[PDB]
Amino acid sequence: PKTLIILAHPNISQSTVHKHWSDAVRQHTDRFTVHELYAVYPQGKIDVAAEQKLIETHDSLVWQFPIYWFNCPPLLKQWLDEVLTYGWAYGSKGKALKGRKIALAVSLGAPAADYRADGAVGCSVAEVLRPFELTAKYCNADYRPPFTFHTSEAARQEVERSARDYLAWLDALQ
Amino acid sequence: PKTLIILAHPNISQSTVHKHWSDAVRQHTDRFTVHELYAVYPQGKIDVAAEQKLIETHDSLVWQFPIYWFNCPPLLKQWLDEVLTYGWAYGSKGKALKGRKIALAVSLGAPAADYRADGAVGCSVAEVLRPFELTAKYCNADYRPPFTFHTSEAARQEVERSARDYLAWLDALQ
Numbered sequence: 044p045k046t047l048i049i050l051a052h053p054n055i056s057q058s059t060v061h062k063h064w065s066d067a068v069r070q071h072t073d074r075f076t077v078h079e080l081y082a083v084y085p086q087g088k089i090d091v092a093a094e095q096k097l098i099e100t101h102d103s104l105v106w107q108f109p110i111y112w113f114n115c116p117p118l119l120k121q122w123l124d125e126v127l128t129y130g131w132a133y134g135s136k137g138k139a140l141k142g143r144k145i146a147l148a149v150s151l152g153a154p155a156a157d158y159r160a161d162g163a164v165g166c167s168v169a170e171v172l173r174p175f176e177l178t179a180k181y182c183n184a185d186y187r188p189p190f191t192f193h194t195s196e197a198a199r200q201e202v203e204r205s206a207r208d209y210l211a212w213l214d215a216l217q
Numbered sequence: 218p219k220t221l222i223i224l225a226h227p228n229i230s231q232s233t234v235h236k237h238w239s240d241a242v243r244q245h246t247d248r249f250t251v252h253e254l255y256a257v258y259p260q261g262k263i264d265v266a267a268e269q270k271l272i273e274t275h276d277s278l279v280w281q282f283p284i285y286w287f288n289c290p291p292l293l294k295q296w297l298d299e300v301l302t303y304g305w306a307y308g309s310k311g312k313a314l315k316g317r318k319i320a321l322a323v324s325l326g327a328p329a330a331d332y333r334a335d336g337a338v339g340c341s342v343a344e345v346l347r348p349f350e351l352t353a354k355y356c357n358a359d360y361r362p363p364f365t366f367h368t369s370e371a372a373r374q375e376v377e378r379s380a381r382d383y384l385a386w387l388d389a390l391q
């Protein structure tokens with residue numbers, strides 16, 4: 044099957060990076076499925092059954108989102124809590140993610156130079172994303188290296204380049 | 218002023234640890250203010266102005282919540298994104314948290330032995346909570362060591378003891 048992209052962005056219209064990323068991926072619907080949580084669940088009423096079946100019908104799983112306060116948007120956190128249930132994602136009968144490739148595709152609003160021991164943040168991007176790595180590993184998934192991008196003509200071209208790199212990263216994952 | 222406790226638990230009624238913690242703190246309303254996000258905002262419509270003013274009228278700030286998927290409950294993440302705005306919590310005019318004591322009070326559903334290099338999780342609790350530490354530090358707050366507890370008669374007594382320790386930790390923070 045194809046790769047399922049769980050895209051969580053509270054306002055993708057005002058988005059530049061994720062909007063470009065989303066557009067690029069929707070050009071190959073036979074290879075990827077862009078699932079926009081905020082668009083599908085504008086009231087936050089996640090359909091667990093629907094979400095789980097979507098994952099089962101796909102192969103690799105990707106969580107795409109902007110890094111807000113060194114974390115994910117709220118709807119993604121809710122998605123994790125309500126979709127990865129005991130008996131499905133983990134626990135005795137829960138093997139839905141066992142051996143499944145899981146990776147993150149994220150954007151950061153600070154320079155990469157900041158996420159270093161000698162940088163303003165003092166921590167690496169990997170240390171920041173640890174919660175999601177632990178989540179995937181807990182469910183016995185095959186956690187893969189994340190796709191990252193740190194955020195106007197030249198700038199616009201760079202974002203376009205990132206979108207192309209994202210596609211390549213996606214294919215590699217497959 | 219007193220300490221403001223931002224308590225984020227999606228179902229505190231079915232809670233045992235946080236329910237006991239909350240009850241213990243509400244015994245001293247002249248020292249602490251328990252602000253239950255899910256009870257105050259059952260529809261997720263956070264009143265930013267109200268939240269910010271609440272923090273300004275208090276001294277130390279505490280975020281109390283159960284660790285769900287090595288992270289916080291969704292409403293707390295939303296709270297962080299919507300309340301810590303540019304010009305208030307950070308940025309040129311944003312000094313609302315500057316020098317303010319910020320700490321977390323959390324419960325974990327796995328033994329402490331798991332959160333070690335030689336444990337099932339492979340990471341420490343500190344590495345897990347990093348996102349919140351970075352958030353507080355980014356806003357120039359005085360991040361303090363967190364209060365942690367790893368989760369029936371003897372068990373019930375231990376939870377009661379944890380509630381007492383929480384109070385002591387709270388006073389120390391003050």
Ligand SMILES: Cc1cc2nc3c(=O)[nH]c(=O)nc-3n(C[C@H](O)[C@H](O)[C@H](O)COP(=O)(O)O)c2cc1C
Pocket residue numbers: 052055057058059060061062109110111112113114150151152153194297298299
């Ligand atoms: C509430 C709020 C919190 C933010 N926190 C962070 C932060 O912790 N680290 C970071 O990399 N960027 C931070 N940002 C910036 C966004 O990551 C950046 O603007 C985003 O990648 C751009 O979105 P887009 O890619 O959809 O255009 C924050 C922005 C907002 C809006």
Ligand SMILES: Cc1cc2nc3c(=O)[nH]c(=O)nc-3n(C[C@H](O)[C@H](O)[C@H](O)COP(=O)(O)O)c2cc1C
Pocket residue numbers: 123124125226229231232233234235236283284285286287288324325326327368
């Ligand atoms: C959706 C879901 C995800 C959970 N994830 C974790 C986990 O990452 N680490 C952990 O310490 N406990 C985990 N737990 C267990 C809770 O932390 C534990 O049951 C909680 O502290 C108990 O709540 P109470 O203290 O209000 O009684 C999870 C529970 C649920 C319900």
